[PDB]
Amino acid sequence: IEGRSRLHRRVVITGIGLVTPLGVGTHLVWDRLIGGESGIVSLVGEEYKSIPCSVAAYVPRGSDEGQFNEQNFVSKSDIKSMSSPTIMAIGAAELAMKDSGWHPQSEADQVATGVAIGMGMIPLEVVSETALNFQTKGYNKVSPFFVPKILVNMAAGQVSIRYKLKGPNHAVSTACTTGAHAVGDSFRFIAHGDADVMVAGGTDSCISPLSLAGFSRARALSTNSDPKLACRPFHPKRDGFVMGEGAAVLVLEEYEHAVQRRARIYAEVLGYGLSGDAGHIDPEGEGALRCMAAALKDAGVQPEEISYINAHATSTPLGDAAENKAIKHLFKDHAYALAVSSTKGATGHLLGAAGAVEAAFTTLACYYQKLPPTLNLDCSEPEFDLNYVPLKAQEWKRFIGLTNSFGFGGTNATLCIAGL
């Protein structure tokens, strides 16, 4: 009546695929990130005069190495029935499986491999254009692919079909927290015995006048016209986030499964914490504290064992300060022994993909024992007195990291990830 004990398995990360404003491809992206590079640029197009915002972080497109070329992954015929985020997700999943050396062929390997890829927001423009087409050209001009193009779970569905992944098929949609939940849920499915491998992550492409209008009106997007300075987490002059686009996918695998096939293992997922603010759609950051605490409890590790936090910090006056507070309250005097950085200066806020790209960055920090910098942080206010890895990457017991994702609607998640 109190329950039964069951085997709870260890879970590792063996592959990473990245489609980001810093570029495409695992170690290329990590190099640029560590080298202090950024993908934030000025918005181009006449359609953007209607909005106060003038910057964003785009995925670089083209045929050079490190650029995104859709035609490498999908046919011209597929591009009509798939949204841009779905295409980005297929690219990232392909690169992740290649990075892992996992290409399931047998029925047993296919059924043992699932997919958990989330999306924060559906493609607004596709809905917008179809509505107008329906109203002016009639029913029979609506694409038969409209529904399959606009469902949140379609990226996970398409990756499953493309790579014949037949295990659990799951898609979360929790705004900025989306990518973190996808990795955590996958971790849990594997530990529980539902799958031996999970292809997990997040994707989003929300850069459009309407989307940016919506976010400008509902939250704080920076109005800074200088793309080199717009996004500055923890900085006195921070004034809102910068929208990015992209997809990040990780291959999670049961430990003995990985060892048996002699996979290269980046890191171990130790813990997963979740909480709700239950406040507003909190300057003390209580929700953030409870979520980090939950991840520590899940991992069975003490606060003093943590050496690195990849912060959610999106460059907002209230948000960055609340997270800083939650960190200080939880870690107390140990807060001064660890390092904290936000990589959003480099990628922008990738929304649905943010938690996944940052889980990948934390995974690589564990692997390389090196910390990506917080860009643009040349000074700080008294309350910001921690080591935020300002400007330049730093070299760095077991290496244990946390990565935080806090989303619209008060939904919070933290992942605890460690070196092996």
Nearest to ligand [N+] of 84, 310 (CB atom): 310
Tell me how far apart the alpha carbons of residues 29 and 231 are, in angstroms, rounded to a whole number. 19
Q: Which does 341 bind (CB under 5 to 8 A by kind): ligand [N+], a copy of itself, none?
A: none
Tell me how far apart the alpha carbons of residues 71 and 73 are, in angstroms, rounded to a whole number. 5
Q: Please indicate whether residue 8 is annotated as part of the active site.
A: no
Nearest to ligand [N+] of 123, 184 (CB atom): 184
Q: Please indicate whether residue 176 is annotated as part of the active site.
A: yes
From the number of C-beta atoms within 10 Å of its C-beta (0-12, 13-18, 19+), residue 222 rates as buried
Nearest to ligand [N+] of 205, 342 (CB atom): 342
Tell me how far apart the alpha carbons of residues 317 and 44 are, in angstroms, rounded to a whole number. 27
The least distance separating ligand [N+] from the CB of residue 180, rounded to whole angstroms, comes to 7
Catalytic residue, chosen from 231, 312, 366, 416, is 312
Sign of CA pseudo-dihedral 368, 370, 373, 374: positive
The least distance separating a copy of itself from the CB of residue 269, rounded to whole angstroms, comes to 13
The least distance separating a copy of itself from the CB of residue 17, rounded to whole angstroms, comes to 19
Q: Please indicate whether residue 192 is annotated as part of the active site.
A: no
Q: Which does 404 bind (CB under 5 to 8 A by kind): ligand [N+], a copy of itself, none?
A: ligand [N+]
Nearest to ligand [N+] of 156, 340 (CB atom): 340
Partnered with residue 310 across adjacent β-strands are 341, 403
Cα–Cα distances in angstroms (integers) from residue 181 to residues 8, 126, 149, 234, in the given order = 19, 26, 23, 25
Backbone angles phi, psi at 91, to 5 degrees: -60, -50
What DSSP line would sit under 346-400, residue for residue? HH-B-GGGHHHHHHHHHHHHHHHTEEPPBTT-S---TT--S---BSS-EE----E
Stretch that binds ligand [N+], among 5-13, 202-210, 227-235, 308-316 (CB under 6 A): 308-316
Q: Which does 281 bind (CB under 5 to 8 A by kind): a copy of itself, ligand [N+], none?
A: a copy of itself
Nearest to ligand [N+] of 48, 187 (CB atom): 187
404 binds ligand [N+] (CB under 6 A): yes
Q: Which does 358 bind (CB under 5 to 8 A by kind): ligand [N+], a copy of itself, none?
A: ligand [N+]
- Provide the token pair at 145: 């692919």
Which of 211, 310, 314, 347 is close enough to bind ligand [N+] by CB under 6 A? 310
405 binds ligand [N+] (CB under 6 A): yes
Sign of CA pseudo-dihedral 280, 351, 113, 269: negative
312 binds ligand [N+] (CB under 6 A): yes
Burial readout 143-176 (b: 16 or more C-beta within 10 A, e: otherwise): eeeeeebeebbbbbbbbbeebebbbbebbbbbbb
Stretch that binds ligand [N+], among 74-82, 186-194, 333-341, 398-406 (CB under 6 A): 398-406
403 binds ligand [N+] (CB under 6 A): yes
Catalytic residue, chosen from 176, 231, 291, 416, is 176
273 membership: H or E segment, kind and range: strand 267-276
Nearest to a copy of itself of 9, 334 (CB atom): 9
The least distance separating ligand [N+] from the CB of residue 311, rounded to whole angstroms, comes to 6
330-359 residues near ligand [N+], rule: CB under 6 A: 358
Where does residue 311 fall: left (phi above 0), alpha (psi -120 to 50 degrees), or beta otherwise?
Answer: beta
Chain center to CA of 276: 19
374 binds ligand [N+] (CB under 6 A): no
Long-range pairs for 256-261: beta carbons < 8 A, 24 or more residues apart: 256/9, 256/10, 257/196, 257/197, 258/12, 258/14, 261/101
Nearest to ligand [N+] of 20, 83 (CB atom): 20
Site residues (vs ligand [N+], CB under 6 A): 310-312, 358, 403-405
Q: Among all residues, which ones are annotated catalytic?
A: 176, 312, 349
